[PDB]
Amino acid sequence: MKFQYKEDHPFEYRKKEGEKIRKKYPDRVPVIVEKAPKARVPDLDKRKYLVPSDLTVGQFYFLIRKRIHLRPEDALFFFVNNTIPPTSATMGQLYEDNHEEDYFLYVAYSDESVYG
């Protein structure tokens, strides 16, 4: 359900960061990535990313699996607004379709294909 990034920054303080980062990094999008509560996978050390718009979701997936040190036998799934995104979409398209009002895209991850 709830992202800790959203309880730490007032909507005003995270939207400030979001608006100013879209102009400064015009070929990347701002993405928060957090572990689903019941996930049996390691916590991610950094939650805030500037992701190239042209990188695919599948490529982003491989990057995140590496950052949490998954073995190849470990499953991982992403959830964006309660749905699992297709690996062929670009992160720019995923952002355009799913960013919240603070201009951030929120991605949760889990080892199972069910969230919350």
């Binding site: 730490d8 990094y25 990347r28 805030k48 990313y49 992701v51 190239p52």
Partner: peptide, 8 residues
């Protein structure tokens, strides 16, 4: 709060 800037 800072960002982790990825390459392409």
């Amino acid at each position: 709060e800072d960002f982790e800037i990825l390459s392409l």
